[PDB]
Amino acid sequence: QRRFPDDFLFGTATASYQIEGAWDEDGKGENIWDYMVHNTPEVIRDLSNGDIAADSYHNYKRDVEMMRELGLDAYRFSLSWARILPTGMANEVNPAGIAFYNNYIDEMLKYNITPLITLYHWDLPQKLQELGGFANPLISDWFEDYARVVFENFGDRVKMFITFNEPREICFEGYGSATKAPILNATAMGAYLCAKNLVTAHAKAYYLYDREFRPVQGGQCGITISVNWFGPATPTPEDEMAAELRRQGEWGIYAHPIFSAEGGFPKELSDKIAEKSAQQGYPWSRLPEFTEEEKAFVRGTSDFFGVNHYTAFLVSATERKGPYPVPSLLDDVDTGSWADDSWLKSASAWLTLAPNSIHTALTHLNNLYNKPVFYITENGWSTDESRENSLIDDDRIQYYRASMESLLNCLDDGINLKGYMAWSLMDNFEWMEGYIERFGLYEVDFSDPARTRTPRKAAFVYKHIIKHRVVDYEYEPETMVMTIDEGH
Amino acid sequence: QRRFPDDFLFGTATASYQIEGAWDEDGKGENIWDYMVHNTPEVIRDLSNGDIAADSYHNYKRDVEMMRELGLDAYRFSLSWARILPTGMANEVNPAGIAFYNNYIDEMLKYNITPLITLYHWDLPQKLQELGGFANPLISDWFEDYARVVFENFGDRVKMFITFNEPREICFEGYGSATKAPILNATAMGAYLCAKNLVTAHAKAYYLYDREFRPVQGGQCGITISVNWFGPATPTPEDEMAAELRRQGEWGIYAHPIFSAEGGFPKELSDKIAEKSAQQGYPWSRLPEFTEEEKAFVRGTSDFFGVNHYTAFLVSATERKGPYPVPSLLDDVDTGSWADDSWLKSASAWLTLAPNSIHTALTHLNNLYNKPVFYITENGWSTDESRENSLIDDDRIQYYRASMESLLNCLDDGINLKGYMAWSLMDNFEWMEGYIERFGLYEVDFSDPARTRTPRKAAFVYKHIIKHRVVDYEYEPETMVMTIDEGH
Ligand SMILES: *[C@@H]1O[C@H](CO)[C@@H](O[C@@H]2O[C@H](CO)[C@@H](O)[C@H](O)[C@H]2NC(C)=O)[C@H](O)[C@H]1NC(C)=O
Ligand SMILES: *[C@@H]1O[C@H](CO)[C@@H](O[C@@H]2O[C@H](CO)[C@@H](O)[C@H](O)[C@H]2NC(C)=O)[C@H](O)[C@H]1NC(C)=O
C-alpha cells in the first residue's frame, strides 16, 4: 500500500467573503463584492449574495468543531481587509474585526489545528477600488501597510501566510474582464497592469515579513497561484507551442516574476504581446516590461509555491477559439481550450476529472522553477444544489481519490509537496455562480438562519484518508453522523 | 485716461464639455461627465446635461463669427481627450475628432484670431477613470501620450498651450469631495493624491513640449490656476496666518510645486497636514512630501502663469467655519471664509464683485513667484436664467468695467500681464448648476434646436473696450444688432 507520510498536512480551505456573512456588522467597511452585488445583483446567476453566506462570523466555533470531526491537521482561511481596515488604510484598525480573527485562530489552536492565513482572497475595500485598486501602483503601499497590521496582530500564533490567492482571478477576471468583481472589463491593459502591481505588492509584503517579523516569529510567507494543466490538443509542434503560450497567459505571468531565476514576465508571451500592441498602434507594449531592478526586487520573494489545482485542458492553436475581445489577453495568446469529452463532468463547466492532473502540473512546475516547496492550497469538486440525495456524492469521492493517487505519484518522484487542502470545508457563496454550485465536504442549508452544516459522504471518506493515510477503495461509512475521535 | 497697449490680447474662453455637444458622435468615447449625468442625473440642479449644450460641434463657424463681431484678438478653448482618444490611450486616434479641431482652428486663423488651447478642462475619458484617473500615478504617462498627440497635430498652428485648467476644481472638488465629476468624495486624501499626480503630469507634458516641439514650433506651454484673493478678515496676526494657510490650500498646493524656487508643496500647510495626520493615527502624512528629485522635476515647468480669477474672500482663524469632514483639506486648513457682504452679488453664491481683486491677487503672486508672465485666462459674471430682460446686463457691465480698471492698475504697477480672456463667449453648461447660471457675453436659447446665439448688452461694451482700448463709462450701445467692423 502506498502511504502518506505522517507529517504530510491535510486540511480544508475557505475565503472570507464566501463564508463570513456579517457584511456590515461591527464597523466592517464595504468591499468590492458588497458593492457589486448590491448595485448590480443580476451579475450573480441565482441573484444571491454573501450578506449572510454561511454566517461563519457568528458560527466559527462550529466550523472548528467540523475541522475536528474531520481530524484535520490544518485549516486555510482568509482575512477580510475591510473588516480589519474599513477605510482600506491603517489609520483605523477595527477592534471587532481583529477580535473575531483572534477568536477563530485561538479556537483552532485549542484543538491543535494549524492556521494558514491568506491576506487577500478577492475582497478589496471599495474605497481602494474608487482609487483604481490593483490598477493603481500605490496598491503596493496600501497592501504593505495592511500586511503589517496582519503580521503584528496574528503572527505570534500563525506561522504560514499567503499574500494573494489566485492572481489570474483577481487580474484577468476582475480587471481584464467581467467575470469577477470589480468587473472593470478593461480588456486591453487591465490584466497586465494588475499583474505587475500585484506581484510588486506581494514582494513588498514578503520583504516586510522577512525583515521585520520572521526573525521574531519564525514563520513563512508565500503566494498561491492557480495552476491547472494545459496540454496540447494534438501532439503537433503548433499545439505544443499554443499550450506553452496558454500556460504563460494563464499562470506564467504571475508565477514567472516571483519564481524564475531571471524574473520578469515569460519571454515568449511577452514578445507576442509586444508584436500585437505595435500592429494595434500602441506606442509601447500593453505588457509593461520589468526594468532590471524590478526583476531583482520581485524574484526570490516566496518561501513556497502554493498551487490551486483542479483540472486539465486541451489547447489548440486553431480549433474552438471562442470569440475573444480585441485587444485582450486571450486574443494575445490566440488559442482554443477545452476538456476531453470523456473526463467526468462536475456542476462547473470548466471543472472535469482529469486523471493524474495534479502530478502533471506539478512535474512541469517542479522542473521549470528549480524544485520549490509546494502546497496544494485548493482542490475539489462541485455538485448541483438541485441534486437528489445531495449528501451522497460518489462523484466527489471519485474525484478526491484520484487527487490522492496523484499526490502519491508526486511524492514517489521526490517532489517537495508538503500539504493538501480540500476546497471546501462547507458550501459557501461561489462568486458569480452563487449557491448553485456546491463544493462543501459539509452541506450548508442557506434557507435556515442557523445555516446548519451537515456532512456529505465525502467528508467521511476524507476523514478516513486522513486517519489511515491510505486510499481504501472499499471504504464507505456505515453511519452519516460525525464524531470526534480521541486526541482530536 | 488710461489705455491698454495695442499688444494686449483680449479674448474669451470656453471649455469642450460646456459647449460642444455631440457627446457620442463620430467615435467619441465616454467621459466622466457623460457618465455622471447619465447614471445619476439628479446631481445637476436643473436635471440638465451637456449631451447637446450649445452644439458647437456643429455650430463652430457661427462661434467664430461671434469672435469677429466682438473683434477678439484671441480665443481660449479646450480639447476633449475622449473625442481625440476614445479609449484614453494613443493607439486609436479618432480622425473625425482631429478634423473637428482642425476645422475650428483653421476658421479662427482665417479671420486672424489666435487660438489658445487647453489640453484638459475636466473631461477625463471614463475608461481612464475606471483605472483610478488622477488618483493613479500612471495618469502622468497617459497624459504625456495624449499631449504628444495634441502637440503633433495642432502645434504647427497653435503657439499657446495650457495643460490643465484649475487643478483645485479637478482634485479637491472632484476627488476630494462631491461637487465635480467624478464625485469620488475621498475626503481624507483624494485631493492630495490628485495634486501630486496632476503637477507631475503637467511637468511631463512640459518637458515633452520643450524638447520635441518647441524648437520647431516656437510656442509656449503653461498651466492655469484659480487664484481668487483670500485676505484676512481682521487686521490681526491670527487672521493673517489664517489667510496664508487658506491661500496655500486653495491654490498654493498646485502652484508652489511648479512656480516656486524650491518646489514641493507649501511648507506651512504641509506641517499642518503632517500634524493632523499624525494625531489621526495615519502612519505617514496624508500629504505625500516630495523627494528632492521630484521637487526639481516639477519646478520651473511653466512658461507662464495662467490665472483664473473672479473674486475675493475674507478669512478668519476662528469665525464661521463651515462644517468640514474629518479628515479633509478644509479641516486641515481650519479656517472660515466668506465674501464681504457689502459687495455686489451675482447669481452664483461664491461670486461677488470684489473691487480691484485682480490687482490684489496678481500683486501677491508677482512678489511670491519672482515676476513671471501672467495671463488672465478666465474672469466673468453670472446672471439668472429666469431674469426678466436677460439681454440687459448692467451688473455684468459693472463687473467687466471694474475688471478692466484692475488690469490697468496691474499694467501701471509693471506686472507683466499679457492678456485677458472673458468667461464666457456664450452661455454654456455650467457643470452642477446646468443652465441656471448664465455667464455668456452671448445668450444661448437652449430650448431651440439651432441653439441661437444673441448678443447681450455686455457684448457691445466689451467690443468697445477692445476697439478703443479704454473704459468709457458714458458709452452705451446704440444698437442690439451686431456687425463685423472691417479689418476683422
Ligand atoms: C467588455 O468589453 C468588451 C470589449 O470591449 C465587449 O465586447 C465587445 O462588444 C461588442 C458589442 O457587444 C462585440 O460585438 C465585440 O465582439 C466586442 N468588441 C471587441 C472590440 O472585441 C463587451 O461587451 C464588454 N462586456 C461588458 C459586460 O460590458
Ligand atoms: C461624502 O463624504 C462626506 C464626509 O464623510 C459625507 O458627509 C457626512 O456623511 C456622514 C454620513 O455617514 C455623516 O455622519 C457626517 O456627519 C457627514 N459629514 C459632514 C461634514 O457633514 C457625505 O455623506 C458624502 N457625500 C456623498 C456620498 O455624496
Author numbering:
A (entry chain A), B (entry chain B): 22 to 509
Paper quotes:
In addition to residues involved in catalysis, the active site is also composed of two sets of residues involved in the substrate binding: the highly conserved residues in the glycone-binding site (GBS) interact to the substrate glycone through hydrogen bonds and stacking interactions, while residues lining the less-conserved aglycone-binding site (ABS) modulate the Sfβgly transglycosilase activity and its preference for alkyl or glucose moieties. Sfβgly presents the typical (β/α)8 barrel fold seen for GH1 enzymes.
To obtain diffraction-quality crystals, the full-length recombinant wild-type Sfβgly lacking the signal peptide (residues 21–509) was expressed as a secreted protein in P. pastoris and purified by ion-exchange chromatography. Sfβgly crystals belong to space group P1, with 6 molecules (chains A-F) in the asymmetric unit. Although chains A, B and C present the best quality parameters, the six chains are very similar, as seen by their structural alignment and RMSD values for aligned atoms (ranging from 0.084 to 0.192 Å). The recombinant expression of Sfβgly in P. pastoris yielded a protein glycosylated at N206. We were able to model two NAG moieties at this position in chains A, B and D and only one NAG at this position in chains C, E and F, for a total of nine NAG residues. The refined Sfβgly structure presents a Tris molecule, a known β-glycosidase competitive inhibitor bound at its active site. The oxygen atoms of the carboxylate groups in the side chains of catalytic glutamates E399 and E187 are 3.9 to 4.8 Å apart from each other (as expected for retaining β-glycosidases) and hydrogen bond the Tris molecule complexed at the active site. The highly conserved glycone-binding site (GBS) is composed of residues Q39, H142, N186, W444, E451 and W452 (red), which hydrogen bond hydroxyl groups from the substrate monosaccharide and are located at the bottom of the active site (red).
